[PDB]
RNA sequence: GUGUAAGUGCACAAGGGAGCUUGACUGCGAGACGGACAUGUCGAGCAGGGACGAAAGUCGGGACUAGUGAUCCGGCACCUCU
RNA sequence: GUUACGGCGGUCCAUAGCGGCAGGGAAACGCCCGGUCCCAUCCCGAACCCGGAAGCUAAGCCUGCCAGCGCCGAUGAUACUACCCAUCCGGGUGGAAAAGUAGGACACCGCCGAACA
């Protein structure tokens, strides 16, 4: 019993990337490592309840309890003080990460209103992708009747890639809906 | 795994407009998930 | 003028120098920080005062880049 | 050319650093030597060190074929290795030691072998 | 006022009293601490008086 | 960055986090520093009874140096004193 | 006794570091596979722990070579200075820098243990 995305990466995607880049040793095949979802509330500095709403949204979508991030710096323009909750974060690894990736790619992304594609320019040197949503309605794990206010995220997919090209190739093989440039 | 810290998990069958039965884990408790659109039918994935 | 205020001199510094023979418990240096670190047979006090734990001769050395104070067990007659 | 550090780098540096931070309080003498244990994924090793002279009065490991023959688990191998270090210290004239855990946590194999040494006549 | 002088009579009689200060608004309730009592020779709890 | 001035320190952390806890002890104290005197300061180690730790061990408040007032007179608690 | 070996320590703790180029897996060192058991995440078997060895030296590690960056660093001379002369200017005896240069340097030593004799 294996996640189908993990099965695919193990069998066909690994061989494809090995052919494409001709890695000298078997352990250069760039694979994903973990997925991090960030929901920076910001407005929680006034009202604490928004952090709990973010907690519930992340727990329902990703499937595991999120970790509240403390404000490590005090600032007055955002009237931020040290220690109050600011955002939530979940680190996804292994089978849970694979199944979340499958769910998002095959269900959540096409549910985006006028979804035209994700720019393949968002990698940073080492082929780690970081995009960001605006609302949370795309997931059916949450309910539009249940929700009351949109809450975007920052999904980060750190891989074993060393270059932007290798990372974009691996993610494109994974089934990522990139644009064309 | 801390036991009482996470929500429930269940194998859920995702149903698209194409007719594909998708036995996979999720937290929705309906058993079978039905959705109108997915990667197998969306115009961007299908080039339309 | 605002000025005119100062505190008393604290008489800090090194009390026993290299080669001096001392008894156990004798104060070696009076310092604020850990300008000298304790070495062998040398303890550190609440106010970061170095003192001797055994009789012997004071020896100043450096351990991994820190200046240290040690006590050498002088030979019994 | 991988972009950053390997996981083995992080593990090795962290273990060396946290072995050093505990060596602040633990040092071995002639009559009271330091029992420092190095644990690997496939093996475990122990030595008896007199830190003033920088010597080694006794040593034991799972490398030895005599202790390789036990079919027991890794914990069983550690228990046996603790027994060997115990009676080799006995033959070395050493009675009391100080247990250096080598930057590993005190649990599992290391705890099992330390308890084996404690029961086998090494007071620490 | 705040951090005033407060007294801990040995719960086990003995009239053994330790003194110390505490913030009377951080800890409005009476302080309870287990302390050594000389005449009993044991570590008995002490209550704020 | 270290609660707080400045300085001497601290990345080996004395800086950040968590678990348990009250040593912010009782009887003492070799030896010292500083000093007109009165003050002040450090202190290993011993005993009792504890905390933490597998253990070694550490703990007589706080990284250190300010946060204070002699004597007289009187109040309160206890004592096998009168 | 020997090996491109693993550990535990050193040295007024870089002359040692960093970087570049070329190599290796005998036992070891690792990466690695998995979460059934001890144990763990302020969420995450990522880490800690446990159970294994299918794969791999791409990394760690260590070997050889590079002065490239850092680092160490004379002698001489000078600055400064104690004492003494000197009406000022300055001088005599002694001590003697920092900087800079010549240069050194891609560490050395100790104790165990692996594989080999």
XYZ file of C-alpha atoms (C1' of nucleotides) in Angstrom:
678
model
C 0.000 0.000 0.000
C 1.689 3.143 -1.316
C 0.430 6.608 -2.254
C -0.027 6.743 -6.007
C 2.062 9.910 -6.289
C 4.896 8.237 -4.376
C 4.552 5.125 -6.552
C 4.709 7.306 -9.663
C 7.778 9.200 -8.456
C 9.534 5.973 -7.476
C 8.857 4.223 -10.782
C 8.465 6.572 -13.748
C 9.516 10.059 -12.606
C 12.838 8.860 -11.190
C 13.745 7.106 -14.444
C 12.585 10.102 -16.480
C 14.743 12.544 -14.514
C 17.695 10.140 -14.599
C 17.461 10.034 -18.389
C 16.957 13.800 -18.664
C 19.910 14.900 -16.534
C 22.234 11.846 -16.636
C 23.121 11.879 -12.951
C 26.453 10.227 -12.197
C 25.097 8.402 -9.135
C 21.670 7.046 -8.210
C 21.367 9.414 -5.228
C 21.309 12.645 -7.227
C 17.689 12.130 -8.344
C 15.971 15.293 -7.040
C 12.950 14.302 -4.988
C 10.620 16.305 -2.771
C 11.485 16.569 0.930
C 8.663 18.370 2.745
C 5.748 20.735 2.157
C 5.220 23.775 4.390
C 1.949 25.722 4.493
C 2.040 29.201 6.033
C -1.079 31.176 6.974
C 0.101 34.546 8.243
C -2.945 36.114 9.857
C -1.374 39.466 10.711
C -4.720 40.884 11.829
C -4.650 38.495 14.803
C -2.627 41.189 16.591
C -5.989 42.782 17.415
C -8.240 39.749 17.888
C -6.981 36.341 18.971
C -9.893 34.456 17.382
C -8.436 34.744 13.877
C -5.495 32.557 14.904
C -7.948 29.857 16.008
C -9.798 30.145 12.710
C -6.490 29.706 10.893
C -5.706 26.723 13.134
C -8.995 25.076 12.196
C -8.531 25.800 8.485
C -5.022 24.336 8.403
C -6.002 21.318 10.507
C -8.939 20.560 8.218
C -7.030 21.042 4.956
C -3.628 19.503 5.676
C -5.075 16.976 8.127
C -2.753 17.522 11.105
C -2.680 20.053 13.914
C -0.870 23.275 12.939
C 1.768 25.058 14.991
C 1.207 28.669 16.033
C 4.120 30.970 15.184
C 5.091 33.657 17.688
C 6.018 37.189 16.643
C 9.790 37.230 17.137
C 10.121 40.992 16.569
C 8.177 43.963 17.924
C 7.082 46.670 15.489
C 4.780 49.660 15.887
C 3.685 50.352 12.304
C 1.971 46.955 12.388
C 1.615 47.457 16.183
C 3.245 44.055 16.618
C 4.514 42.988 20.040
C 6.775 40.091 20.949
C 4.945 36.878 21.786
C 1.518 37.201 20.372
C 0.290 34.713 17.743
C 0.787 35.828 14.137
C 0.504 32.790 11.874
C 0.187 29.028 11.737
C 2.445 26.514 10.031
C 2.362 22.811 9.154
C 5.311 20.712 8.013
C 4.234 17.775 5.844
C 6.526 14.799 5.298
C 6.289 11.286 3.934
C 2.963 9.697 3.089
C 0.918 12.607 4.435
C 2.889 15.017 2.250
C 2.421 12.784 -0.800
C -1.328 12.472 -0.260
C -1.704 16.213 0.338
C 0.213 16.885 -2.877
C -2.050 14.487 -4.771
C -5.202 16.027 -3.300
C -4.100 19.598 -4.012
C -2.860 18.952 -7.554
C -5.781 16.804 -8.683
C -8.628 18.558 -6.834
C -7.836 21.902 -5.240
C -5.898 23.656 -8.006
C -8.544 23.133 -10.752
C -11.146 24.475 -8.302
C -9.411 27.873 -8.334
C -11.559 30.515 -10.006
C -10.280 31.306 -13.537
C -7.205 29.187 -12.827
C -4.801 29.902 -15.694
C -1.639 28.286 -14.318
C 1.237 28.855 -11.895
C 4.287 30.749 -13.109
C 7.345 28.454 -13.249
C 9.507 31.437 -12.274
C 8.844 31.116 -8.525
C 11.812 28.832 -7.811
C 14.808 30.235 -5.914
C 18.205 28.904 -6.931
C 17.785 25.437 -5.439
C 14.461 24.562 -7.067
C 12.156 25.062 -4.078
C 8.719 26.230 -5.182
C 6.704 28.780 -3.210
C 3.320 30.032 -4.402
C 0.439 31.566 -2.507
C -3.343 31.310 -2.550
C -5.887 33.984 -1.635
C -8.831 32.059 -0.153
C -9.356 28.509 1.120
C -12.567 27.542 -0.708
C -10.795 25.337 -3.274
C -10.462 22.495 -0.762
C -13.667 20.572 -0.109
C -12.256 19.519 3.251
C -13.536 22.938 4.308
C -17.108 24.091 3.710
C -18.206 27.425 2.245
C -21.106 27.510 4.701
C -18.622 26.846 7.508
C -16.113 29.481 6.379
C -16.727 33.177 7.004
C -13.583 35.011 5.823
C -10.948 34.087 3.221
C -7.511 32.949 4.378
C -4.719 32.481 1.857
C -1.631 30.350 2.312
C 2.000 30.048 1.226
C 2.724 26.487 0.079
C 6.457 25.735 -0.022
C 7.662 22.507 -1.624
C 11.341 22.038 -0.799
C 12.953 19.345 -2.941
C 16.351 17.700 -3.324
C 16.939 19.757 -6.478
C 20.062 21.890 -6.774
C 19.036 24.132 -9.688
C 15.844 25.880 -10.727
C 15.782 23.849 -13.948
C 15.965 20.475 -12.193
C 13.308 21.502 -9.685
C 10.968 22.779 -12.384
C 11.498 19.574 -14.375
C 10.715 17.408 -11.343
C 7.612 19.406 -10.439
C 6.407 19.423 -14.054
C 6.812 15.644 -14.140
C 4.870 15.488 -10.865
C 1.869 17.069 -12.588
C 2.313 20.711 -11.664
C 0.197 23.081 -13.823
C 2.917 25.518 -14.844
C 2.487 28.257 -17.410
C 4.881 28.552 -20.361
C 7.697 31.090 -20.643
C 2.062 10.595 16.750
C 0.414 12.380 19.627
C -2.939 10.649 19.697
C -5.648 13.167 20.555
C -4.029 16.094 18.758
C -5.053 15.386 15.154
C -8.424 15.064 13.378
C -9.873 11.846 11.970
C -8.518 10.095 8.875
C -10.357 7.839 6.437
C -9.984 6.380 2.968
C -12.283 8.498 0.791
C -13.296 7.855 -2.818
C -13.050 11.016 -4.931
C -15.660 11.224 -7.707
C -15.214 13.570 -10.668
C -17.450 14.334 -13.627
C -15.442 11.882 -15.740
C -16.437 8.877 -13.618
C -13.219 7.977 -11.786
C -13.350 6.212 -8.411
C -10.448 7.541 -6.318
C -9.796 5.482 -3.177
C -7.459 7.711 -1.150
C -7.125 8.977 2.410
C -8.716 12.232 3.592
C -10.699 13.544 6.564
C -14.136 13.896 4.942
C -16.480 11.396 6.587
C -18.922 10.820 3.707
C -16.920 7.795 2.523
C -17.174 8.728 -1.155
C -16.295 12.279 -2.218
C -18.062 13.670 -5.297
C -16.655 16.705 -7.121
C -17.712 18.280 -10.411
C -14.212 19.007 -11.752
C -10.686 17.681 -11.304
C -7.377 17.419 -13.154
C -8.885 14.885 -15.570
C -11.525 17.328 -16.860
C -10.242 20.871 -16.314
C -9.632 22.880 -19.519
C -6.092 23.909 -18.521
C -4.974 20.320 -17.958
C -6.798 19.213 -21.119
C -5.511 22.131 -23.196
C -8.941 23.670 -23.780
C 26.542 71.328 36.295
C 24.988 67.863 36.232
C 28.242 66.006 36.901
C 29.947 65.356 40.233
C 28.788 61.793 41.016
C 31.071 58.765 41.114
C 31.210 55.423 42.883
C 33.894 54.105 45.201
C 36.925 52.285 43.855
C 36.348 48.543 44.113
C 40.034 47.537 44.437
C 39.714 44.874 41.753
C 42.646 43.105 40.161
C 45.148 40.317 40.665
C 46.090 39.615 44.283
C 48.664 36.818 43.937
C 51.035 36.756 40.976
C 52.966 33.999 39.245
C 55.121 31.925 41.565
C 53.535 33.039 44.834
C 52.708 30.155 47.160
C 49.201 30.227 48.619
C 46.974 28.332 51.024
C 43.645 26.757 50.156
C 40.868 29.335 50.023
C 43.157 32.284 49.291
C 41.765 34.849 46.861
C 43.755 35.008 43.621
C 42.039 37.701 41.526
C 39.139 40.093 42.073
C 37.430 40.659 38.730
C 34.042 41.652 37.366
C 33.725 39.420 34.314
C 35.624 36.231 33.663
C 38.739 38.013 32.453
C 40.660 35.049 33.867
C 39.109 31.673 33.925
C 39.563 29.086 36.684
C 42.090 26.381 35.922
C 43.207 23.404 37.981
C 42.578 23.651 41.736
C 40.983 27.081 41.169
C 37.347 27.916 41.878
C 35.038 30.760 40.905
C 32.936 32.758 43.349
C 29.550 34.412 43.244
C 31.084 37.727 42.186
C 33.340 35.844 39.735
C 36.245 35.837 42.188
C 38.988 33.268 41.651
C 40.370 31.442 44.678
C 42.634 28.501 45.428
C 41.219 25.059 46.181
C 44.572 23.510 47.163
C 47.909 24.823 48.443
C 50.575 25.500 45.859
C 52.071 28.093 43.532
C 50.127 30.418 41.246
C 50.625 29.731 37.535
C 49.105 31.800 34.718
C 48.304 29.907 31.532
C 46.121 29.984 28.439
C 43.611 27.224 27.677
C 41.981 27.262 24.228
C 42.520 31.007 23.905
C 41.328 32.001 27.395
C 43.754 33.213 30.035
C 43.498 30.848 33.000
C 44.844 30.649 36.549
C 46.098 27.359 37.979
C 47.671 26.114 41.203
C 50.795 23.949 40.999
C 51.238 21.476 43.890
C 54.721 22.474 45.103
C 56.875 19.549 46.208
C 56.747 18.586 49.869
C 60.168 18.964 51.638
C 27.512 20.208 -5.733
C 24.591 20.020 -3.299
C 23.290 23.420 -2.255
C 23.726 23.075 1.503
C 24.851 20.684 4.217
C 24.040 16.994 4.296
C 22.038 15.490 7.136
C 25.125 13.509 8.173
C 27.000 16.783 8.605
C 24.311 18.167 10.885
C 24.118 14.975 12.938
C 27.894 14.650 13.331
C 28.448 18.300 14.248
C 25.532 18.320 16.694
C 26.717 15.131 18.389
C 30.306 16.371 18.667
C 29.120 19.704 20.083
C 26.797 18.126 22.687
C 29.458 15.587 23.663
C 31.769 18.526 24.251
C 29.212 20.417 26.314
C 28.894 17.455 28.676
C 32.665 16.919 28.817
C 32.730 20.194 30.774
C 31.592 18.293 33.875
C 32.798 14.744 33.108
C 36.512 13.949 33.111
C 38.312 10.706 33.901
C 41.204 9.983 36.259
C 43.400 6.961 36.953
C 41.302 5.472 39.759
C 38.110 7.075 38.411
C 38.303 6.848 34.604
C 35.706 8.073 32.134
C 33.648 5.398 30.372
C 32.927 7.061 27.018
C 30.587 5.231 24.639
C 30.414 5.714 20.878
C 27.208 4.309 19.387
C 26.604 3.742 15.682
C 23.636 2.405 13.748
C 25.316 -0.998 13.344
C 27.626 -1.164 16.374
C 28.525 0.221 19.795
C 31.935 0.887 21.339
C 33.188 1.774 24.821
C 36.567 2.755 26.266
C 37.985 3.549 29.704
C 39.893 6.837 29.536
C 42.211 8.549 32.009
C 41.927 12.132 30.800
C 45.026 13.475 32.573
C 47.346 11.128 30.674
C 45.212 10.678 27.555
C 45.384 6.872 27.703
C 42.908 3.992 27.484
C 42.933 1.333 30.196
C 40.308 -0.902 28.569
C 37.995 -1.039 25.575
C 35.142 -3.105 24.181
C 32.958 -3.084 21.094
C 30.576 -5.136 18.990
C 33.354 -5.408 16.390
C 34.753 -8.382 18.319
C 33.705 -11.695 16.789
C 33.226 -13.151 20.275
C 30.380 -10.676 20.851
C 29.315 -10.878 17.196
C 28.095 -14.442 17.747
C 25.147 -13.540 19.990
C 21.966 -13.662 17.911
C 20.221 -11.173 20.217
C 19.091 -7.723 19.134
C 21.194 -4.547 19.137
C 20.169 -4.145 22.778
C 21.470 -7.648 23.498
C 24.763 -6.785 21.804
C 25.042 -3.653 23.942
C 24.270 -5.674 27.084
C 27.048 -8.114 26.235
C 29.456 -5.266 25.419
C 28.708 -3.692 28.785
C 29.530 -7.034 30.393
C 32.889 -7.209 28.605
C 33.839 -3.649 29.516
C 32.810 -4.480 33.081
C 35.030 -7.478 33.639
C 37.881 -5.967 31.616
C 37.780 -3.040 34.042
C 37.699 -5.673 36.791
C 40.874 -7.210 35.362
C 42.309 -3.689 34.982
C 41.987 -2.955 38.706
C 39.422 -0.193 38.112
C 36.408 -0.224 40.436
C 34.561 3.107 40.118
C 34.023 4.975 36.841
C 32.120 7.973 35.501
C 29.768 7.265 32.608
C 30.261 9.472 29.555
C 27.334 9.076 27.170
C 29.279 10.541 24.252
C 26.723 13.119 23.173
C 23.919 10.583 22.809
C 20.815 10.528 24.952
C 20.706 8.078 27.858
C 18.208 5.560 26.554
C 17.794 2.449 24.481
C 21.041 0.651 23.725
C 23.261 2.991 25.736
C 21.016 2.756 28.795
C 20.866 -1.032 28.454
C 24.641 -1.389 28.288
C 25.204 1.098 31.118
C 22.794 -0.870 33.307
C 24.571 -4.085 32.315
C 27.892 -2.569 33.387
C 26.344 -1.292 36.627
C 24.990 -4.716 37.557
C 28.211 -6.474 36.521
C 30.208 -4.741 39.271
C 31.048 -1.248 37.961
C 29.774 1.294 40.496
C 28.738 4.487 38.735
C 2.553 48.084 48.114
C 4.201 45.267 46.096
C 6.942 42.890 47.166
C 6.250 43.688 50.816
C 7.676 41.696 53.700
C 5.663 38.527 54.295
C 6.070 35.724 56.815
C 5.684 31.950 56.415
C 4.788 30.236 59.677
C 5.637 26.539 59.703
C 2.387 24.720 58.999
C 3.608 22.123 61.488
C 3.343 24.577 64.371
C 6.899 25.007 65.674
C 6.495 28.754 65.099
C 9.296 28.482 62.570
C 8.980 31.567 60.418
C 10.737 32.295 57.150
C 10.403 35.766 55.668
C 10.559 36.931 52.056
C 8.783 39.230 49.610
C 6.261 38.677 46.841
C 4.204 40.802 44.478
C 0.820 41.020 46.183
C -0.996 41.430 42.853
C 0.925 38.785 40.909
C 0.142 36.351 43.755
C -2.839 37.758 45.682
C -3.456 34.401 47.351
C -1.323 33.270 50.266
C 2.042 31.728 49.417
C 2.648 28.045 50.155
C 6.188 26.662 50.108
C 7.793 23.515 51.516
C 10.772 24.445 53.694
C 13.095 22.844 56.214
C 12.035 23.364 59.822
C 14.905 23.182 62.332
C 13.230 21.932 65.518
C 11.263 19.246 63.678
C 14.304 18.501 61.520
C 12.145 17.816 58.454
C 10.929 19.577 55.306
C 7.422 20.671 56.222
C 5.179 22.998 54.199
C 5.049 26.656 55.202
C 2.045 28.962 54.821
C 1.945 32.731 54.551
C 0.620 34.247 57.759
C 20.623 39.109 23.060
C 21.564 39.054 28.233
C 14.878 42.587 33.347
C 17.309 47.554 34.381
C 22.930 52.667 33.543
C 27.826 51.691 32.034
C 31.756 48.664 32.100
C 34.108 43.626 32.366
C 32.106 39.137 30.382
C 29.263 35.378 28.006
C 28.379 31.582 21.033
C 31.807 26.025 25.389
C 27.191 30.033 26.113
C 25.906 33.511 31.295
C 21.861 34.119 24.954
C 16.591 30.823 23.272
C 13.077 26.359 24.784
C 10.961 22.454 27.764
C 10.133 18.858 32.224
C 10.291 18.523 37.560
C 10.962 21.671 41.736
C 11.676 25.612 46.269
C 18.955 25.315 48.259
C 15.199 32.687 47.751
C 17.734 26.015 53.416
C 19.165 24.904 59.246
C 24.111 24.379 62.431
C 28.650 25.894 60.870
C 32.924 27.343 58.461
C 39.813 26.199 57.187
C 41.525 30.242 54.512
C 41.451 34.977 52.625
C 40.360 40.231 50.051
C 39.451 45.206 51.394
C 40.222 48.191 55.022
C 41.655 54.489 60.626
C 37.576 52.189 62.946
C 32.525 50.874 62.105
C 30.903 48.664 57.936
C 31.681 45.410 53.407
C 33.274 40.904 50.255
C 34.640 35.772 48.661
C 34.967 31.025 50.322
C 36.395 25.045 49.846
C 34.693 21.682 53.192
C 31.627 19.055 57.337
C 26.520 17.538 59.489
C 20.983 17.477 59.041
C 17.071 17.288 55.844
C 15.697 17.978 50.589
C 15.292 19.314 44.791
C 16.832 17.855 40.064
C 19.660 13.819 37.594
C 20.631 6.975 35.278
C 24.935 8.743 37.321
C 28.886 11.888 38.081
C 27.280 15.689 40.391
C 25.039 20.904 41.074
C 21.812 23.888 44.264
C 23.201 28.488 51.159
C 18.628 33.228 44.961
C 19.331 36.044 40.050
C 26.340 36.854 34.329
C 28.858 40.332 37.846
C 29.203 45.203 40.192
C 23.810 49.708 42.562
C 18.158 48.700 44.579
C 20.137 51.185 50.927
C 20.221 53.289 57.208
C 24.408 52.194 62.782
C 22.908 52.813 67.808
C 18.916 53.791 71.014
C 13.711 52.912 71.870
C 9.452 49.964 71.043
C 6.197 45.724 68.544
C 5.377 40.534 67.211
C 6.452 34.964 67.364
C 9.085 30.942 69.979
C 12.641 29.287 74.424
C 14.315 23.377 79.223
C 16.423 31.702 80.803
C 15.032 34.891 85.101
C 55.285 -3.981 12.453
C 52.134 -1.959 8.028
C 46.986 0.641 5.659
C 43.597 6.570 1.177
C 41.080 3.285 8.312
C 37.564 4.330 13.110
C 37.619 6.510 17.934
C 39.321 9.292 22.645
C 42.798 13.434 23.955
C 46.508 17.389 23.525
C 49.064 22.459 21.605
C 50.560 29.839 25.095
C 44.319 25.907 19.993
C 44.133 28.533 12.417
C 51.634 27.439 10.925
C 45.973 23.784 12.080
C 40.887 27.435 9.293
C 38.355 28.337 4.584
C 38.549 27.602 -0.645
C 40.115 24.902 -5.317
C 41.577 20.292 -8.018
C 42.212 15.108 -8.223
C 40.535 9.722 -5.273
C 38.096 5.478 -1.746
C 34.444 2.059 1.128
C 38.550 -4.471 3.751
C 36.554 -3.979 8.545
C 34.755 0.472 10.261
C 32.315 5.704 9.465
C 28.178 7.180 7.101
C 24.219 8.228 3.926
C 19.927 4.468 3.496
C 14.989 1.205 4.440
C 10.706 1.181 8.108
C 7.802 2.797 12.378
C 6.216 -3.425 15.351
C 8.495 -2.575 20.301
C 11.457 1.797 24.419
C 11.040 6.735 23.138
C 9.686 11.891 20.185
C 7.695 16.441 17.659
C 5.769 23.565 21.209
C 2.846 20.393 14.089
C 6.117 16.960 11.376
C 9.868 8.955 12.822
C 12.603 16.129 9.658
C 15.302 15.582 14.436
C 15.359 12.022 19.081
C 14.554 6.603 19.623
C 13.932 1.801 18.111
C 14.153 -2.525 14.378
C 17.086 -3.790 9.816
C 20.766 -3.838 5.807
C 18.251 -3.617 -0.491
C 21.203 0.309 -2.517
C 25.349 4.201 -2.695
C 30.553 6.677 -1.779
C 26.788 11.568 -4.793
C 27.852 13.856 0.477
C 30.102 13.383 5.594
C 35.022 11.340 6.551
C 39.875 10.847 5.378
C 44.264 10.709 1.137
C 47.427 13.614 -2.389
C 48.493 18.434 -4.621
C 47.683 23.934 -4.814
C 49.986 30.336 -0.901
C 44.329 31.504 -3.644
C 41.869 33.908 0.799
C 42.908 33.961 5.726
C 46.770 32.894 9.665
C 51.934 33.005 11.827
C 56.151 35.983 11.261
C 61.852 37.756 11.831
C 66.596 40.950 11.524
C 67.622 45.845 10.797
C 65.920 50.641 11.401
C 62.579 53.945 13.659
C 58.709 55.726 17.273
C 58.589 55.762 22.389
C 61.014 55.480 26.954
C 64.376 54.739 32.532
C 68.723 57.217 34.146
C 72.395 61.021 33.265
C 74.419 65.461 30.820
C 72.929 69.814 29.052
C 71.296 77.767 30.267
C 66.833 76.430 25.374
C 68.040 73.394 21.026
C 69.866 68.634 21.771
C 73.077 64.759 23.367
C 75.129 59.902 26.052
C 74.279 54.741 28.331
C 70.323 50.945 28.521
C 65.364 48.868 27.100
C 62.794 48.646 22.781
C 57.842 48.607 19.573
C 53.368 48.740 16.223
C 53.327 48.810 11.018
C 56.144 46.873 6.939
C 59.428 43.465 4.635
C 62.452 38.551 4.133
C 60.025 34.421 5.163
C 56.794 30.142 7.346
C 52.601 27.582 6.534
C 47.553 23.318 2.749
C 49.425 21.084 10.845
C 52.290 18.134 14.665
C 52.137 14.840 18.952
C 49.866 10.753 22.434
C 46.867 6.481 23.709
C 43.422 2.542 22.062
C 40.821 -0.206 18.256
C 39.828 -2.190 13.074
C 42.060 -4.938 8.354
C 46.844 -7.086 6.981
C 51.968 -9.681 8.710
